[PDB]
Amino acid sequence: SKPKLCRLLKEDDSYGFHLNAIRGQPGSFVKEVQQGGPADKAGLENEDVIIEVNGENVQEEPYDRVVERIKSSGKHVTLLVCGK
């Protein structure tokens, strides 16, 4: 449940995690956190839910749009996430 605010620095052109969606509901969830990658260093865990990308609420955005937002963020990205 706890909210987590973090800022990630791209390494190997990647943040070292992926997003998925759940059928029947909006929202974007973390999966596949690469051990020792940027996301992992920031304590992101699988099934963490993306709340804000760079201060913008993305909870009503399909996850592919959220992926595009994160990609478009450049060499850093700030995320607010909620664990479940």
Query: Any idea where the domains of the chain sit in the sequence?
Result: 1-84
Please report the resolution in angstroms: 1.7
The first and second tokens of residue 20, run together, are 């998925």
Buried b (16+ CB within 10 A) or exposed e, 7-43: ebebeeeebbbbbeeeeeeebbbbeebeeebbbbebe
The span from the CA of 81 to the CA of 11, in Å, is: 20
Method for structure elucidation: X-ray
Where do we find the tokens 């009503």?
60
Q: How far is CA 8 from CA 25, 73, 74, 81, in A?
A: 27, 11, 11, 13
Which residue spans within the chain are E strands per DSSP? 3-9, 18-20, 29-31, 49-53, 56-57, 76-82
In angstroms, the CA 71 to CA 84 distance is 24
May I ask the CATH architecture of the domain 1-84?
Answer: Roll (2.30)
State how far the Cα of 78 lies from the Cα of 6, in Å rounded to an integer.
6
